[PDB]
């Protein structure tokens, strides 16, 4: 917002004033004749119509700008950073890295590399305008061509730079007869107004709902494309096959299953193993997923596993201790049609 400075008008009697140009933004001046102002104690002066009035005004930046303002940037490209959680050696570990295929991060003797982002799509735009805590995709007018009553009506290079540019059609008018005062046709401030018609923020208009923050401005949590990850894992974690207990006498059964967004499937497997030990479990068909990663096996015992599927009839193999076991079942539709968690 801008402040309009209009010092005390110059009054004169029996003589005439004159306009001297001022090298100030949107500075304007005018003169009038025949005005006969009156004050509390009576007429200012005697000259009935020979008197004259000179007025002038200009517009400057407001000190409030140092605290409140709207800033227009021309952000074009972006970089990606991401946070990952990895189950390693039976514990959750957090990693942070730039998701552009360059940053490499060492953790627990293993080297992780993430990115680059498959999709270059962004929710932002070449030109953006930011308020205190809001961001807007909007093509601001070019500097020095602000249209009055609209965003950019006053342009400043920086909040502290003294130089400014303005366009406000500051036209004066003849003062009311019998009174001493200065009228001004100051243009209404388009900046304050734009705050009134800002519209929807980009945190709602962004496709894929990429949450937007500030200081710094980032777009976060939007699902687009995929990520490549390369992990160099030292052999220390690796265990020779002989170390792992063997497995035999594999049987599978499904007392019931329910294709749903949750782990609605339960499978009971009878197994026999050489010795007590951990053993990984996996499903080699992408159509089905298993919540569990590994499990301890003692020998001729059984175990239960919770899994999620989408097939009406679930017919799949399961891998454990380098062995395959079939599993066939007929799931049923649940009752709910929509869920909150993803």
């Amino acid at each position: 917002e801008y402040k309009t400075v209009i010092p005390s008008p110059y009054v004169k009697c029996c003589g005439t004033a004159e306009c001297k140009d001022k090298s100030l933004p949107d500075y304007s001046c005018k003169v009038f004749t025949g005005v006969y102002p009156f004050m509390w104690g009576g007429a200012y002066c005697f000259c009935d119509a020979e008197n004259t009035q000179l007025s002038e005004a200009h517009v400057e930046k407001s000190e409030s700008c140092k605290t409140e303002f709207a800033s227009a940037y021309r952000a074009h490209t972006a970089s990606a950073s991401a946070k990952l959680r990895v189950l390693y050696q039976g514990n959750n570990i957090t990693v942070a890295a730039y998701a552009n295929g360059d940053h490499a991060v060492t953790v627990k003797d293993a080297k992780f590399v993430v990115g680059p982002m498959s999709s270059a799509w962004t929710p932002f735009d070449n030109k953006i305008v930011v308020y205190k805590g809001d961001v807007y995709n909007m093509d601001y007018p070019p500097f020095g061509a602000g249209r009055p009553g609209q965003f950019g009506d006053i342009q400043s290079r920086t909040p502290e730079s003294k130089d400014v540019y303005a366009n406000t059609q500051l036209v004066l008018q003849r003062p009311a007869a019998g009174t001493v005062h200065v009228p001004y046709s100051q243009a209404p401030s388009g900046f304050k107004y734009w705050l009134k018609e800002r519209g929807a923020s980009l945190q709602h208009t962004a496709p894929f709902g990429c949450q937007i923050a500030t200081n710094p401005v980032r777009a976060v949590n939007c699902a687009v494309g995929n990520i490549p990850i390369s992990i160099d894992i030292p052999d220390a974690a690796f265990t020779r096959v002989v170390d792992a207990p063997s497995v035999t006498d594999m049987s599978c059964e499904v007392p019931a299953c329910t294709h749903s967004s949750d782990f609605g499937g339960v499978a009971i497997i009878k197994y026999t193993a050489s010795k007590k030990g951990k053993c990984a479990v996996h499903s080699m068909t992408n159509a089905v997923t298993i919540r569990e990663a590994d499990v301890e096996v003692e020998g001729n015992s059984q175990l239960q596993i919770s899994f999620s599927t989408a097939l009406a009839s679930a017919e799949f193999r399961v891998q454990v201790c380098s062995t395959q076991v079939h599993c066939a079942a007929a799931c049923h539709p649940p009752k709910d049609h929509i869920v909150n968690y993803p």
């Binding site: 917002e1 209009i6 010092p7 005390s8 008008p9 110059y10 009054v11 004169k12 102002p37 004050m39 509390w40 104690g41 009576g42 007429a43 200012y44 002066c45 005697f46 407001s62 000190e63 409030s64 140092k66 605290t67 409140e68 205190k132 805590g133 009174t179 001493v180 005062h181 200065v182 304050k192 705050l195 009134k196 929807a200 709602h204 208009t205 962004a206 496709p207 894929f208 709902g209 687009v224 294709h259 749903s260 967004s261 009406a312 009839s313 007929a330 049923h332 539709p333 649940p334 009752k335 709910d336 049609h337 929509i338 869920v339 909150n340 993803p342």
Partner: protein
């Protein structure tokens, strides 16, 4: 102790409204209104000083006002302001007052004189607090979220916000004159007065002593006391001294600006009923509030409505999910799950329902 206003003086300027329709001259003229603060508190510039006496003290009891080209002190208590109902004053210093006032369109100020007189002025100024957050709230809550917002402060030491003060030009008053059998008598009573008359002889002259110009009508001319002792801070209404634009003497404007957190109410959690791939949210506004919804995919499907009554709204979820923002509360996400148990595999086929409920219009036109 923030004492820079030694040589200042109040105005007595043409206020736009002295009451009852006619506009006259009052000591409470106002010419500047600042409302850029998001919180809603307003600075009000005022003609007359406050918090001082003639001896330049700092007690808040009194305030300075001009009258008959002479200063006087009046009780600070009677000062008040209004827009539609009595407002609340918080700032009292120099020529600026910090006040907060409910939604109002005009703005008047009033005070009681040592003259036991009520002097009041008003300006039409549309004061509309900006709705911060979606929930258009009018009184901040016991419980709610906190958001940043601009506002003012009580500090009385500014940083390079200067306002010039200049020597008052003059005040031409003819009460000093009086006709003595065609002999005008001008009384000075201890000031510097320039008289100037179209009459001959001593037509012009600056004096500080009572004078007489014989054989001339009082209405012949006018004279003005030329005061140049205590400076008067610039305003558009006051005429200029007629020599140049600026004059030495600058004062800082107090009550700077900063942004602080402010509270904002949450919204009644709506009651949601259910249907096939469809959600029926019933909403209780409790006050004007915004409800928006958008798809979770590459297409927004943006919508945002204002609500003030209980609307029961229905949304059809897409296969990729849908999120709805209600007031300032955290948005709720709903994404579809499989549709129905109606379909089932068995001796009666009942597979068309399978391939319709799941992947409707697909794997069915394939049939």
């Amino acid at each position: 102790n923030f004492n820079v206003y030694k040589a200042t003086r109040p105005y007595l300027a043409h206020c736009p409204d002295c009451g009852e329709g006619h506009s006259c001259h009052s000591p409470i003229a106002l010419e500047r209104i600042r409302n850029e603060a998001t919180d809603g508190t307003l600075k009000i510039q005022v003609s007359l000083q406050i918090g001082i006496k003639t001896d330049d003290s700092h007690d808040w009891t009194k305030l300075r006002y001009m009258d008959s080209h002479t200063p006087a002190d009046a009780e600070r208590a009677g000062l008040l302001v209004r827009t539609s109902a009595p407002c609340t004053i918080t700032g009292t210093m120099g020529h600026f007052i910090l006040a907060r006032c409910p939604k109002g369109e005009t703005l008047t100020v009033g005070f009681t004189d040592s003259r036991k007189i009520s002097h009041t002025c008003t300006h039409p100024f549309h004061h509309e607090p900006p709705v911060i957050g979606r929930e258009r709230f009018h009184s901040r809550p016991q419980h709610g979220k906190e958001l940043p917002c601009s506002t003012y402060v009580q500090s009385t030491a500014a940083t390079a916000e200067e306002i010039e003060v200049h020597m008052p030009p003059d005040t031409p008053d003819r009460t000093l004159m009086t006709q003595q059998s065609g002999n005008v008598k001008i009384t000075v009573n201890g000031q510097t007065v320039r008289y100037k008359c179209n009459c001959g002889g001593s037509n012009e002259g600056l004096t500080t002593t009572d004078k007489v110009i014989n054989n001339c009508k009082i209405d012949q001319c006018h004279a003005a006391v030329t005061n140049h002792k205590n400076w008067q801070y610039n305003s558009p209404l006051v005429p200029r001294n007629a020599e140049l634009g600026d004059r030495k003497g600058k004062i800082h404007i107090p009550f700077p600006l900063a942004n602080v957190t402010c509270r904002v109410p949450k919204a009644r959690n709506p009651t949601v009923t259910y249907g096939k791939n469809q959600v029926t949210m019933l909403l209780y506004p409790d006050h004007p509030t915004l409800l928006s919804y958008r798809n979770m995919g590459q297409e927004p499907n943006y919508h945002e409505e204002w609500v003030t009554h209980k609307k029961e709204v229905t949304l059809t979820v897409p296969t990729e999910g849908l999120e709805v923002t209600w007031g300032n509360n955290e948005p709720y996400k709903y994404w579809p799950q499989m549709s129905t148990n109606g379909t089932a595999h068995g001796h009666p086929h009942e597979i068309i329902l399978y391939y319709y409920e799941l992947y409707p219009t697909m794997t069915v036109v394939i049939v």
